[PDB]
Structure formats: structure tokens, C-alpha cells
């Protein structure tokens, strides 16, 4: 033990018996072990952590040390040589709408957040890290390799602060550092409601006994709601356009405004909660504020689970869907529902599905205005383009008619993210998400590519020849071994994303395993899974089955034409139908009378 204060939240709870509703923090879901899956606990470790000193020091930290006898390559060099490309022509996913990417980021934020330590760090530390690229304490800077273009405009590095972690306590026993998951591991709409109780309360409209969530009082979108503003100064969302000075949104998850289409989906989900609460208050005039809130919350939660498991995962996992996630057989309280540390890297496959632009489309799905198509980089922490420039309807139409990027082994991450990322505590559109992901793997003590291959029962290549065969690409394998020297040292994020995709899915074998396992567990280990007998009545369940993303849009925007299968690539007008053609959520089963 030395004595640097760590990241530190506030854990466990005492358990209501027949509460038919989730706690906010996720506690008491598992009765035998009530903190399992709760927020602000350690990410689970499926494998032992791998640090330079076995405890906390990341691989890459110390210069004359090695990982299995080789130096680990600079995160930014990997990014440049393997992950980058110039030509966007032909990169789109011909069979996935942009909503596919976007629903992923949504589900990811419901499940995991490992907070970082920059905001809470001293000004000195921040300056040493950004200004001077000085490694030490929480600063683990991402150094530019020789010849990096950014040497000519941004100095020697990008600053990077280590993830928060669970505090060494008595007994004091030497144990490897564990990063925190600040949200609930359950797929439970925590990104709307919050994972912490004072936040959840602040988000609620407690001024009326109508169980509503609070909405913005300064702006509306053709009469429809926006989230409240987060009214701190300073705000990154204000920083990117001080003349507009439109703050970030306040939602159940703090990342909600990181980009405009994420904020768009958060907005839809919030609108849907209030829609539900109003429809239930009509059906059950006697229900009080709490009951309306909880019951709406419970339905929104189920909506997320259904869209995720029925529509989304089958198109991520393809032929592996059934293998990892066989038909449900009910709650198993021996299942660990916690999100693993590795899954928080595995689920960043999403970063390769994000295209270089976002479009606003009018009601004929044609470009909306003279600035119809926007570069992605201008949309990070951007709420003013929503509030001052058309609201969400034109963005929602783009979600449906435009495509996700397709992961490609020589076009991995768009430069909008690999060179122009804006980070909320800094001032430049010049960060590299890919480098940051790699650096972060090391921060979190990730075992390497082959450790995970073996965990998943997959071959572990050792030579160029073996790696070529796994990746079905000789050049990519060559470039990886020139950088990493042994496949054992390949960082999980890039190794997993390098593998060719499984049939009918959008990830390879390794990722299919890590993701498939996790999703199996968050379903099987959740007492309030929507299909678990007793959570919903059977009539409630038969209604829920009809939910769709298209109907969510129909109900919470003024978009009047939608496809049936919103995750598929769909072209207007041939694939689009009027909203009367889309099933509704029939709420009569929630009719609670006295007799
Ligand atoms: C424009 C789109 C996106 C942006 C700008 C974005 C940005 C970021 C940023 C800045 C981080 C934090 C990186 C770090 O410090 O380690 C991150 C993490 C993450 N991203 Fe994304 N990302 C996007 C899309 C997606 C998508 C589509 C997925 C999944 C399908 C996703 C999944 C994640 C996950 C799992 C994490 C780790 C979260 C945690 O547990 O802390 N991202 N992304
Ligand atoms: C696109 O994928 C979906 C799976 O949702 C499939 O039903 C559809 O027919 C596919 N079409 C093509 C050309 O890949
Ligand atoms: C709370 O609800 C009332 C209607 O009961 C509405 O007039 C008011 O604006 C709401 N407040 C917020 C913050 O949403
Ligand atoms: C900033 O926003 C203002 C006011 O909303 C808008 O008129 C202007 O074009 C924006 N400028 C930039 C540089 O984004
Ligand atoms: C619950 O989980 C464990 C571990 O996966 C397993 O051995 C056991 O079969 C499961 N229980 C039931 C009733 O399926
Ligand atoms: Ca959650």
C-alpha cells in the first residue's frame, strides 16, 4: 500500500420482499447475493487481471520491461498502421441501417460505464498530462509515434487518464486492481432512469403525481419533449458553439449527449416513458405518482430487452446466436449477472460500425436543407443542432434510411473518430478513439488475445502462419505481428475486431463468444427479466411481444412513414409504410380495477 486516493462510490442495500419493481441501483435483484449486478461495484473478472507488476501497473508503462519478452506497441501506432483508412467509398453496411450502430451504443450504456479520473484530478495533474505528456499517477498518456501528422499540430501526445477503481480496503490483502461499473449490469433502462437514487429522483417530475419524468422547460420539438438541460457551467455542449450555448441534456446516463444520434434515442426513450405514464394514468386514474412511474419504467425496461434480444443480437451474433443464447428457460439465480471487464472492450466493436457522416432528411426522405449532411466530428457533444436546427424528426429519418458502417479489415475506424474525437474535458477535435480503446485495455489489465481465444475454446495462433489462417488475411496478420511480435500480446479490442465475421452476424468467433456469454448471463441472471414468470402477467407479455422500434418512432415523433424492420437497410419509399400498419403496444392488460 502506498496512499493515492482512489475512485470511490457507495454500495449495499436491505431487501424488499415482494416488491414487483427493480431498485434503481440494481441491488436485491439476486436475493442470495444482493449486490450482484448492482451499480458502483467492481466489473467482474472472467480471467485474472494482467498487469506489469501483477497488481495495477499497465503493460506499456515502463520502458525497459516487456510483456512476454517484447515491448508493446504504442496504441497510436497500431491505430495508424492497422485501424485507419481514407476512402469511405464502399464502407457502408448494405444490410444494416444506421439504427443498428446506434442501438448498440444505447444497450452498451444501459450495461456498463467505467468512469475515469480526469474531472476529479488536480489542475496540475491535468496540465502535466495534457501540456507536458508526463506519465505518472492517473496520467497514462498516448504518445505519438514518429512521423505522426499530429506531431505537427498537437504536440507529443494525447492525454489519457486511468479508469476509476475499487479502493484497497482492509484486510489490505494484495489484490489486482478492479475497475468500476457505475451503472446497473441488468438491461433495465438505467440509461433513462439513472443507476443512482438521488439522480433518479432529480430526473423525475415530482411536481405532479403523474409519474412523469422531468422534461425541458426551455425548448420543445414541435410540441414534443426534450430532456432537461444539465445546467452546470462549464459544459462541453456549450463549448462547441458558445454563440448557441445549448447545454448537454440531463439523462439517466451521463454520456447521453456524446453524439447527436445518441441524444436522439435518449429523447425517444424519455418521450416513451411519459407516453406510457399518461396512458396508464388514464386507464388507472386511482394509481398514484409512484406507481405510474414504476409501471412505466418497468414497461420501458421490457421494451429494451425485447428489441435487444429479438431484433439486435441475432444480427450481431448471426449463426452463433442460438449457441450462446438458447431459448430462455427461466431465471437461474446461480448465474452471475455482472458485466465483465472484458465485455466492456468486446462491445466496442461498435466503433467500427460508425460512419463518417450523419444526415437530416425531410418528410420525403430527401436532404433537409443546405447543410443536410454533417461530418460526424462536428456532432460530438452537440445539442444545438437538435434544439436550434430541426429537432429530432430529421435525424430519426436518417437513422432509418441511412446505413451503419461495415467493419472491414482494411477500413476499421473512420477518421471522424480516429483523428477528430472531441473529449469533454479538452478543447480539440483531435483525439483517437481507437488508440484510447487500446490504451484502455492496458489500463484495465486485459489479458491478451490468445488468453481470450483459449477461454472461448478457440485455437491460439503462435506464428504468422497460424494468425494468417485465423484472420484469413496475410497482410493484416503481418502488420499485427510486426507491431505485437506474438499474438499473445495483441490487445483484446483489436484482436477480436480483426477476426472475420461469423456467418450472418457482424462480429467474429472470439467476440461472439464474449458477447454471447455476457448477454446469456444478463438474461438468465436477471430476476426481473421480462419473460420470467411473475414479472408480467401473461396478457402483458403477449402485448409486449408486439413492440418494435418503428412503433416507438411512430408514437414519439412526427415521422409518419417507417419501415417494418427498422434494423435492416430500408430505402424510401419502397420499404416504408404508414404508421397505421405497425402494431401498437396494447395497454389494456395494465387496466387495474377494484373488483
Ligand atoms: C459516434 C459513436 C460513438 C462514440 C462517439 C463513442 C465514444 C466512446 C468513448 C469516448 C468511449 C470512452 C473510451 C475510453 O475512455 O475508454 C467509448 C466507450 C465505449 N463505447 Fe463507444 N462510441 C460510439 C459508439 C459506440 C457503439 C456503436 C458501441 C457499441 C455498439 C459503443 C460501445 C462502447 C462501450 C462498451 C464502451 C465502454 C463503456 C464503459 O464500460 O465504460 N460505442 N465510446
Ligand atoms: C439482410 O439481413 C436480414 C436479417 O435480418 C435478412 O432477413 C435479409 O433478407 C438480408 N438481406 C441480404 C441481401 O443480405
Ligand atoms: C411536471 O408536470 C406538469 C404537469 O403535471 C407540467 O406542467 C410540468 O411542466 C412538469 N415539469 C417538468 C419539469 O417536466
Ligand atoms: C453556432 O450556432 C449559432 C447559433 O445557434 C449558429 O447560427 C451558427 O452557425 C453556429 N456556428 C458554428 C460555428 O457552429
Ligand atoms: C444454473 O447455473 C449453473 C451454472 O451455469 C448450472 O450448473 C445450473 O445447471 C443452473 N441451474 C438450473 C436450474 O438450470
Ligand atoms: Ca442497466
XYZ file of C-alpha atoms and ligand atoms in Angstrom:
695
model
C 0.000 0.000 0.000
C 1.045 3.496 -0.982
C -1.514 6.336 -0.489
C -3.172 7.854 -3.631
C -6.952 8.287 -3.069
C -8.906 6.015 -5.489
C -12.241 6.320 -7.297
C -14.904 5.633 -4.605
C -18.791 5.280 -4.803
C -21.253 3.982 -2.059
C -22.630 0.255 -2.209
C -25.106 -2.306 -0.483
C -28.939 -2.376 0.330
C -31.671 -4.027 2.583
C -34.221 -6.076 0.522
C -37.958 -5.536 -0.088
C -39.734 -8.850 -0.366
C -42.479 -8.925 -2.985
C -41.527 -5.572 -4.486
C -42.627 -6.134 -8.024
C -40.158 -3.399 -9.175
C -36.397 -3.103 -9.585
C -34.343 -0.975 -7.270
C -32.538 1.932 -9.032
C -29.019 0.678 -8.110
C -29.752 -2.910 -9.064
C -29.354 -4.238 -5.511
C -31.626 -7.018 -4.244
C -32.138 -8.451 -7.732
C -30.308 -11.546 -6.609
C -31.765 -12.493 -3.215
C -28.966 -14.855 -2.168
C -26.307 -12.235 -3.080
C -27.973 -8.830 -3.244
C -25.102 -6.699 -4.665
C -24.649 -8.904 -7.741
C -25.199 -6.748 -10.767
C -25.651 -3.617 -8.703
C -24.085 -0.329 -9.811
C -20.820 1.071 -8.421
C -19.088 -2.235 -7.838
C -16.166 -3.926 -9.481
C -16.514 -5.209 -13.002
C -16.368 -8.928 -12.914
C -13.209 -10.701 -13.965
C -13.659 -13.851 -16.018
C -9.862 -14.183 -16.162
C -7.197 -12.891 -13.760
C -6.005 -9.346 -14.437
C -2.738 -8.913 -16.249
C -0.646 -6.001 -15.148
C 3.052 -5.269 -15.486
C 3.538 -5.768 -11.760
C 0.606 -8.147 -11.233
C -1.410 -5.528 -9.367
C -2.089 -2.243 -11.103
C 0.704 -1.127 -13.431
C -0.388 -1.316 -17.068
C 1.506 -3.137 -19.708
C 3.180 -0.304 -21.705
C 4.064 1.695 -18.605
C 7.734 1.005 -18.035
C 10.264 1.215 -20.775
C 12.844 -1.499 -20.149
C 10.161 -4.085 -19.084
C 8.304 -6.340 -21.507
C 5.159 -8.292 -21.938
C 6.153 -11.927 -22.576
C 9.570 -10.605 -23.648
C 8.513 -7.991 -26.181
C 7.691 -4.312 -25.923
C 4.050 -3.474 -26.523
C 3.418 -1.187 -29.497
C 2.262 2.415 -28.988
C -1.544 2.479 -29.079
C -1.444 5.341 -31.652
C 0.922 3.375 -33.945
C -1.419 0.465 -34.008
C -4.253 2.872 -34.762
C -2.320 4.493 -37.647
C -0.980 1.262 -39.255
C -3.864 -1.064 -38.747
C -7.051 0.765 -37.825
C -7.037 3.851 -40.142
C -8.277 4.487 -43.698
C -9.027 7.373 -46.039
C -11.609 6.226 -48.527
C -15.199 5.930 -47.271
C -16.442 4.780 -50.633
C -17.902 1.305 -50.352
C -17.559 1.077 -46.494
C -21.255 1.071 -45.677
C -23.187 -1.964 -44.416
C -25.539 -2.682 -47.222
C -27.919 -4.576 -44.926
C -27.961 -2.518 -41.735
C -29.500 0.880 -41.072
C -27.605 3.374 -39.013
C -30.008 2.424 -36.159
C -28.164 -0.830 -35.820
C -24.988 1.004 -34.787
C -26.993 3.329 -32.647
C -28.975 0.715 -30.728
C -25.655 -0.898 -29.835
C -24.317 2.226 -28.189
C -27.654 2.508 -26.350
C -27.548 -1.072 -24.985
C -23.872 -0.630 -24.161
C -24.693 2.405 -21.938
C -27.519 0.538 -20.170
C -24.933 -2.159 -19.264
C -21.574 -0.572 -18.494
C -19.643 2.575 -17.613
C -16.123 2.556 -16.138
C -15.686 6.134 -15.059
C -12.414 7.875 -15.387
C -10.455 10.112 -13.086
C -9.700 13.291 -15.102
C -12.532 15.598 -13.896
C -11.719 14.732 -10.258
C -7.909 15.147 -10.786
C -5.914 18.285 -9.738
C -5.347 21.033 -12.245
C -1.644 20.375 -12.012
C -2.088 16.696 -12.943
C -4.274 17.658 -15.882
C -1.671 20.153 -17.074
C 1.189 17.761 -16.666
C -0.744 15.215 -18.681
C -2.026 17.380 -21.499
C 0.676 20.067 -21.714
C 3.725 18.041 -20.850
C 2.815 14.433 -21.708
C 4.277 13.351 -18.385
C 3.465 9.802 -17.348
C 2.660 9.301 -13.643
C -0.173 8.573 -11.231
C -3.502 8.689 -13.241
C -1.851 10.149 -16.376
C -1.004 7.377 -18.894
C -0.538 9.493 -21.972
C -0.960 8.178 -25.506
C 2.355 9.070 -27.153
C 2.569 9.818 -30.892
C 4.901 7.617 -32.888
C 7.445 9.180 -35.229
C 6.040 10.718 -38.423
C 2.505 11.056 -36.925
C 0.796 14.026 -38.595
C -0.410 15.131 -35.242
C 3.129 15.916 -34.160
C 2.740 18.995 -36.432
C -0.456 20.256 -34.812
C -0.990 18.710 -31.350
C 2.327 18.163 -29.622
C 3.770 14.847 -28.468
C 0.734 13.002 -27.091
C -2.922 12.870 -26.325
C -3.646 12.921 -22.641
C -5.341 9.960 -21.066
C -6.474 9.330 -17.533
C -6.825 5.890 -15.960
C -10.180 4.384 -15.076
C -11.513 4.684 -11.531
C -11.249 1.578 -9.457
C -12.311 -0.146 -6.246
C -10.396 1.139 -3.175
C -7.859 -1.085 -1.388
C -9.520 -1.806 1.920
C -8.729 -3.727 4.964
C -7.928 -6.637 5.263
C -5.380 -4.890 2.957
C -4.560 -8.087 1.148
C -2.653 -7.562 -2.181
C -5.184 -7.852 -4.945
C -5.218 -6.775 -8.563
C -6.977 -3.506 -9.369
C -10.600 -3.741 -10.460
C -12.313 -1.003 -12.447
C -15.858 0.008 -11.508
C -19.095 -0.389 -13.349
C -21.071 2.742 -12.496
C -24.322 1.535 -13.994
C -26.562 -1.489 -13.376
C -25.489 -4.689 -15.165
C -29.091 -5.544 -15.827
C -30.662 -4.467 -19.098
C -33.121 -2.309 -17.302
C -33.296 1.125 -18.888
C -30.840 2.529 -16.378
C -29.625 4.883 -19.104
C -33.051 6.616 -18.849
C -33.749 6.409 -15.097
C -30.291 6.552 -13.579
C -28.356 3.872 -11.619
C -28.015 6.011 -8.503
C -31.023 7.078 -6.348
C -30.601 10.875 -5.926
C -30.105 11.227 -9.692
C -33.109 9.069 -10.412
C -35.192 11.288 -8.183
C -33.899 14.500 -9.710
C -34.877 13.212 -13.162
C -38.448 12.618 -12.112
C -41.265 15.112 -12.280
C -42.303 15.053 -8.631
C -44.318 18.265 -9.031
C -47.251 16.320 -10.343
C -48.414 12.951 -9.026
C -48.481 11.655 -12.626
C -45.281 9.541 -12.545
C -43.712 11.602 -15.361
C -40.038 12.159 -15.985
C -38.952 15.795 -15.997
C -38.716 17.466 -19.411
C -37.015 20.605 -20.737
C -38.905 23.838 -19.933
C -36.878 25.989 -22.325
C -37.363 24.045 -25.580
C -39.807 21.766 -27.313
C -39.689 19.951 -30.723
C -42.994 20.823 -32.412
C -44.696 20.381 -29.075
C -42.789 17.178 -28.138
C -40.445 16.941 -25.165
C -36.730 17.179 -24.798
C -34.711 16.046 -21.872
C -33.933 18.658 -19.285
C -30.692 20.594 -19.636
C -27.830 19.806 -17.430
C -27.230 23.393 -16.158
C -23.645 23.185 -14.886
C -21.047 25.628 -16.050
C -18.781 24.795 -17.853
C -20.486 22.461 -20.387
C -18.780 20.793 -23.336
C -22.013 21.028 -25.346
C -21.919 24.795 -24.834
C -18.161 24.901 -25.553
C -18.520 23.591 -29.080
C -20.663 26.621 -30.002
C -20.636 29.411 -27.435
C -22.932 31.600 -29.555
C -25.673 28.961 -29.425
C -24.666 27.992 -25.800
C -27.049 24.974 -25.696
C -26.181 22.715 -22.729
C -25.942 18.996 -22.731
C -29.022 17.004 -21.809
C -29.623 15.526 -18.377
C -30.491 11.835 -18.553
C -30.028 8.590 -16.556
C -26.632 8.182 -18.109
C -24.015 10.957 -18.243
C -22.860 10.105 -21.739
C -26.242 10.937 -23.354
C -25.044 13.896 -25.381
C -21.758 12.425 -26.595
C -23.200 12.499 -30.040
C -26.361 13.761 -31.592
C -27.953 10.424 -32.539
C -27.376 9.060 -29.104
C -29.179 12.087 -27.663
C -31.898 11.474 -30.272
C -32.510 7.938 -28.992
C -32.413 9.070 -25.340
C -35.055 11.629 -26.298
C -37.275 8.927 -27.846
C -36.984 6.743 -24.765
C -37.840 9.623 -22.423
C -40.853 10.608 -24.539
C -41.990 6.975 -24.413
C -41.871 6.891 -20.629
C -44.183 9.889 -20.394
C -46.442 8.449 -23.097
C -46.781 5.281 -21.040
C -47.388 7.138 -17.788
C -50.148 9.180 -19.360
C -51.812 6.188 -20.881
C -51.656 4.312 -17.557
C -52.973 7.299 -15.590
C -55.911 7.291 -17.953
C -56.519 3.557 -17.522
C -55.891 3.667 -13.783
C -56.935 7.140 -12.542
C -56.557 5.817 -8.989
C -52.835 4.919 -9.291
C -50.632 7.399 -7.575
C -47.374 9.059 -8.839
C -45.026 6.268 -7.717
C -46.986 3.516 -9.235
C -47.321 5.286 -12.566
C -43.542 5.952 -12.665
C -42.592 2.411 -11.679
C -45.068 0.783 -14.038
C -43.917 2.961 -16.975
C -40.277 2.226 -16.026
C -40.987 -1.486 -15.966
C -42.544 -1.425 -19.425
C -39.664 0.669 -20.936
C -37.220 -1.766 -19.387
C -39.041 -4.650 -21.146
C -39.172 -2.788 -24.431
C -35.317 -2.501 -24.280
C -34.915 -6.205 -23.532
C -37.190 -7.240 -26.348
C -35.690 -5.106 -29.051
C -32.213 -6.099 -27.883
C -32.782 -9.886 -27.723
C -35.395 -10.385 -30.548
C -34.042 -7.884 -33.126
C -30.484 -6.753 -32.284
C -28.392 -9.703 -31.034
C -29.469 -12.061 -33.809
C -27.935 -9.655 -36.245
C -24.780 -9.246 -34.212
C -24.309 -12.938 -33.460
C -25.620 -14.460 -36.727
C -25.148 -18.271 -36.677
C -23.818 -18.095 -33.120
C -26.997 -16.612 -31.652
C -28.571 -19.987 -30.693
C -25.234 -21.376 -29.496
C -24.716 -18.681 -26.811
C -28.274 -17.643 -26.199
C -30.579 -20.643 -26.443
C -34.340 -20.242 -25.826
C -34.993 -18.924 -22.353
C -35.747 -21.423 -19.583
C -36.299 -19.005 -16.696
C -34.432 -17.186 -14.042
C -31.410 -19.002 -12.709
C -30.156 -17.354 -9.556
C -26.825 -19.240 -9.840
C -25.962 -17.176 -12.925
C -23.562 -14.229 -12.398
C -25.377 -11.277 -13.957
C -22.417 -8.904 -13.587
C -20.851 -7.292 -16.678
C -17.312 -8.451 -17.092
C -14.386 -6.133 -17.588
C -13.622 -7.789 -20.957
C -17.152 -7.290 -22.265
C -16.763 -3.517 -21.899
C -13.968 -3.845 -24.577
C -15.756 -6.526 -26.619
C -18.842 -4.372 -27.044
C -16.682 -1.594 -28.644
C -16.906 -3.497 -31.842
C -19.494 -0.720 -32.363
C -16.698 1.715 -33.043
C -16.105 0.110 -36.426
C -19.813 0.442 -37.399
C -19.903 4.219 -37.094
C -19.822 6.035 -40.489
C -18.257 9.423 -41.262
C -21.408 11.468 -41.634
C -24.919 11.958 -40.201
C -27.866 13.285 -42.314
C -31.012 15.222 -41.681
C -33.768 14.054 -44.080
C -37.104 15.794 -44.786
C -40.502 14.197 -44.979
C -39.787 12.771 -48.383
C -36.538 11.378 -47.002
C -34.578 13.818 -49.152
C -31.731 16.006 -47.801
C -33.138 18.509 -45.392
C -31.704 21.915 -46.190
C -28.433 23.232 -47.486
C -26.488 21.619 -44.526
C -28.272 18.299 -44.772
C -25.217 16.034 -44.403
C -22.940 16.738 -41.422
C -19.468 15.346 -40.629
C -19.663 13.163 -37.510
C -16.895 15.079 -35.779
C -18.970 18.173 -35.575
C -21.680 16.312 -33.704
C -19.764 15.278 -30.550
C -21.396 16.938 -27.539
C -23.707 18.676 -29.984
C -27.183 19.506 -28.775
C -27.604 22.804 -30.618
C -28.059 21.046 -33.947
C -31.103 19.388 -32.332
C -32.543 22.329 -30.436
C -31.784 25.076 -32.986
C -31.751 23.174 -36.205
C -34.829 20.998 -36.838
C -35.300 18.813 -33.733
C -35.128 15.061 -33.883
C -37.500 14.156 -36.750
C -34.909 14.709 -39.500
C -32.285 12.750 -37.544
C -34.714 9.902 -36.871
C -35.364 9.692 -40.670
C -31.648 9.468 -41.234
C -31.407 6.644 -38.667
C -33.840 4.656 -40.778
C -32.780 5.441 -44.313
C -29.037 5.691 -43.899
C -26.676 2.752 -43.276
C -24.225 1.735 -40.481
C -20.607 1.451 -41.498
C -19.457 -2.120 -42.156
C -16.430 -3.299 -40.286
C -13.732 -4.012 -42.880
C -10.266 -5.490 -42.149
C -8.543 -2.590 -44.032
C -11.155 0.110 -43.174
C -11.763 -0.264 -39.435
C -12.468 3.078 -37.778
C -13.425 6.309 -39.575
C -11.101 9.231 -39.107
C -14.011 11.218 -37.657
C -13.350 9.088 -34.580
C -9.739 8.042 -35.105
C -8.438 11.536 -35.630
C -11.158 14.028 -34.675
C -12.727 12.848 -31.462
C -13.682 15.595 -29.045
C -13.395 14.742 -25.352
C -15.425 16.691 -22.858
C -12.590 17.846 -20.595
C -10.416 19.033 -23.515
C -10.638 21.609 -26.256
C -9.747 19.876 -29.540
C -11.319 17.683 -32.105
C -8.144 15.671 -32.262
C -8.399 12.513 -30.165
C -8.202 8.921 -31.478
C -10.884 6.572 -30.101
C -9.018 3.528 -31.400
C -5.826 4.461 -29.579
C -7.830 5.256 -26.484
C -9.525 1.844 -26.611
C -6.124 0.125 -26.864
C -4.649 2.217 -24.107
C -7.709 1.462 -22.034
C -7.409 -2.313 -22.477
C -3.973 -1.984 -20.841
C -5.312 0.374 -18.112
C -7.903 -2.286 -17.257
C -5.484 -5.169 -17.032
C -6.733 -7.081 -20.035
C -5.330 -10.454 -20.769
C -4.264 -10.662 -24.370
C -5.902 -12.069 -27.496
C -4.797 -15.682 -27.049
C -5.890 -15.809 -23.410
C -9.341 -14.908 -24.525
C -9.168 -17.305 -27.540
C -8.392 -20.155 -25.084
C -11.156 -19.103 -22.670
C -13.551 -19.394 -25.574
C -12.222 -22.799 -26.583
C -10.590 -21.421 -29.748
C -7.188 -22.016 -31.228
C -4.349 -19.835 -30.117
C -2.120 -18.962 -33.076
C 1.571 -18.525 -32.336
C 3.153 -17.817 -35.692
C 2.486 -15.605 -38.728
C 1.162 -18.638 -40.489
C -1.348 -19.532 -37.757
C -2.550 -15.935 -37.381
C -2.994 -15.535 -41.151
C -5.309 -18.563 -41.064
C -7.432 -17.237 -38.175
C -7.811 -13.751 -39.709
C -7.969 -15.026 -43.308
C -5.713 -12.146 -44.191
C -1.965 -12.393 -44.558
C -1.172 -8.685 -44.612
C -3.254 -7.806 -41.569
C -1.557 -10.653 -39.708
C 1.799 -9.465 -40.887
C 1.163 -5.927 -39.706
C -0.108 -7.170 -36.349
C 2.987 -9.353 -35.765
C 5.323 -6.623 -36.873
C 3.777 -4.460 -34.135
C 2.998 -7.057 -31.387
C 5.563 -9.826 -32.041
C 3.456 -12.622 -30.733
C -0.274 -12.966 -30.985
C -0.271 -13.333 -27.146
C 0.396 -9.648 -26.828
C -2.375 -8.476 -29.221
C -4.762 -6.227 -27.254
C -8.214 -7.725 -26.989
C -10.079 -4.835 -28.598
C -8.069 -5.037 -31.871
C -7.644 -8.830 -31.920
C -11.263 -9.543 -31.524
C -12.294 -6.914 -34.110
C -9.686 -8.186 -36.582
C -11.383 -11.560 -36.999
C -13.649 -12.127 -39.923
C -17.248 -12.056 -39.099
C -19.295 -15.146 -38.405
C -21.961 -16.132 -40.907
C -24.915 -13.829 -40.839
C -23.503 -11.758 -37.925
C -21.338 -8.656 -37.549
C -18.575 -9.999 -35.233
C -16.083 -12.856 -35.423
C -15.769 -16.065 -33.328
C -13.956 -14.621 -30.360
C -16.272 -11.712 -29.922
C -19.343 -13.856 -30.489
C -18.231 -15.918 -27.527
C -17.503 -12.993 -25.154
C -20.575 -11.056 -26.106
C -22.816 -14.186 -26.338
C -21.812 -15.350 -22.870
C -22.450 -11.943 -21.359
C -25.836 -11.463 -22.897
C -26.881 -15.055 -21.877
C -25.964 -14.173 -18.306
C -27.684 -10.821 -18.127
C -30.866 -12.547 -19.345
C -30.603 -15.795 -17.271
C -29.436 -13.945 -14.149
C -31.980 -11.228 -14.009
C -34.950 -11.905 -11.620
C -36.914 -9.200 -13.454
C -36.246 -10.457 -16.984
C -39.469 -9.664 -18.859
C -40.194 -13.304 -19.722
C -39.562 -14.508 -16.157
C -42.873 -15.926 -14.807
C -44.405 -13.450 -12.301
C -42.708 -10.293 -13.567
C -45.529 -9.603 -16.043
C -48.921 -11.364 -16.354
C -49.251 -13.475 -19.491
C -51.597 -10.971 -21.151
C -48.945 -8.243 -20.516
C -46.363 -10.472 -22.102
C -48.485 -11.111 -25.251
C -48.833 -7.335 -25.782
C -45.140 -6.712 -25.196
C -44.252 -9.136 -27.908
C -45.587 -6.648 -30.480
C -43.261 -3.745 -29.576
C -40.913 -2.513 -32.255
C -38.501 0.329 -32.797
C -40.677 1.528 -35.683
C -43.629 1.923 -33.371
C -41.559 3.741 -30.820
C -40.789 6.310 -33.534
C -44.407 6.446 -34.712
C -45.516 7.135 -31.160
C -42.911 9.685 -30.133
C -42.084 11.754 -33.221
C -43.971 13.241 -36.235
C -42.301 10.766 -38.593
C -45.407 9.177 -40.217
C -43.701 6.759 -42.616
C -41.460 3.936 -41.278
C -40.239 0.502 -42.222
C -41.355 -2.672 -40.562
C -37.851 -3.902 -39.814
C -36.013 -0.802 -38.631
C -32.606 -2.510 -38.229
C -32.489 -3.685 -41.804
C -31.320 -1.451 -44.570
C -34.507 0.123 -45.917
C -34.951 2.530 -48.841
C -37.724 5.112 -49.085
C -40.487 4.728 -50.281
C -40.445 1.051 -51.310
C -39.578 -0.256 -47.815
C -41.677 2.216 -45.912
C -45.216 2.015 -44.667
C -47.619 4.224 -42.922
C -47.604 4.007 -39.111
C -51.141 2.552 -39.003
C -49.515 -0.548 -40.494
C -47.324 -1.060 -37.381
C -48.507 -2.911 -34.285
C -49.079 -0.883 -31.134
C -48.433 -1.748 -27.575
C -51.881 -2.672 -26.305
C -52.067 -1.460 -22.731
C -55.491 -2.819 -21.660
C -53.719 -5.583 -19.692
C -52.440 -2.888 -17.335
C -56.036 -1.892 -16.507
C -56.152 -2.252 -12.690
C -59.693 -2.098 -11.385
C -61.040 -2.507 -7.782
C -63.369 -5.545 -8.100
C -20.336 8.046 -32.627
C -20.435 6.938 -31.913
C -19.639 6.656 -30.712
C -18.831 7.458 -29.963
C -18.510 8.865 -30.234
C -18.285 6.683 -28.891
C -17.348 7.156 -27.999
C -16.804 6.462 -26.973
C -15.976 6.974 -25.938
C -15.271 8.337 -25.836
C -15.745 5.940 -25.074
C -14.823 6.010 -23.846
C -13.470 5.450 -24.261
C -12.478 5.305 -23.112
O -12.089 6.311 -22.434
O -12.035 4.162 -22.796
C -16.480 4.840 -25.553
C -16.596 3.679 -24.855
C -17.482 2.664 -25.200
N -18.085 2.531 -26.373
Fe -18.305 3.917 -27.740
N -18.682 5.441 -29.096
C -19.550 5.337 -30.073
C -20.256 4.228 -30.495
C -20.358 3.029 -29.868
C -21.085 1.931 -30.279
C -21.913 1.859 -31.542
C -20.906 0.954 -29.322
C -21.488 -0.376 -29.310
C -22.253 -0.922 -30.288
C -20.105 1.507 -28.313
C -19.692 0.843 -27.186
C -18.835 1.412 -26.247
C -18.555 0.728 -24.976
C -18.978 -0.621 -24.461
C -17.702 1.493 -24.341
C -17.132 1.151 -22.983
C -18.067 1.732 -21.940
C -17.644 1.500 -20.479
O -17.936 0.393 -19.887
O -17.066 2.413 -19.857
N -19.678 2.745 -28.752
N -17.104 5.157 -26.757
C -30.336 -8.788 -44.534
O -30.329 -9.448 -43.285
C -31.618 -9.875 -42.874
C -31.518 -10.430 -41.463
O -32.294 -9.510 -40.747
C -32.253 -10.851 -43.877
O -33.548 -11.257 -43.492
C -32.303 -10.092 -45.195
O -33.056 -10.812 -46.138
C -30.833 -9.805 -45.577
N -30.608 -9.497 -46.998
C -29.402 -9.570 -47.600
C -29.275 -9.278 -49.072
O -28.377 -9.820 -47.000
C -44.452 18.325 -14.363
O -45.769 18.070 -14.731
C -46.647 19.137 -15.103
C -47.997 18.511 -15.456
O -48.389 17.783 -14.310
C -46.091 20.052 -16.198
O -46.909 21.232 -16.336
C -44.661 20.402 -15.794
O -44.019 21.145 -16.777
C -43.807 19.195 -15.436
N -42.452 19.573 -15.015
C -41.362 19.074 -15.646
C -40.027 19.509 -15.142
O -41.388 18.247 -16.579
C -23.292 28.298 -33.738
O -24.647 28.304 -33.515
C -25.225 29.511 -33.993
C -26.424 29.903 -33.144
O -27.198 28.761 -32.917
C -25.458 29.278 -35.491
O -26.281 30.287 -36.030
C -24.029 29.250 -36.069
O -23.987 28.875 -37.430
C -23.161 28.250 -35.267
N -21.777 28.370 -35.583
C -20.959 27.335 -35.524
C -19.556 27.689 -35.908
O -21.289 26.168 -35.209
C -27.817 -22.516 -13.000
O -26.453 -22.192 -13.324
C -25.367 -23.139 -13.193
C -24.086 -22.597 -13.872
O -24.212 -22.240 -15.245
C -25.706 -24.563 -13.681
O -24.760 -25.584 -13.311
C -27.107 -24.973 -13.231
O -27.457 -26.012 -14.091
C -28.200 -23.920 -13.439
N -29.459 -24.279 -12.766
C -30.557 -24.610 -13.449
C -31.782 -24.952 -12.636
O -30.577 -24.659 -14.686
Ca -28.566 -1.258 -16.709
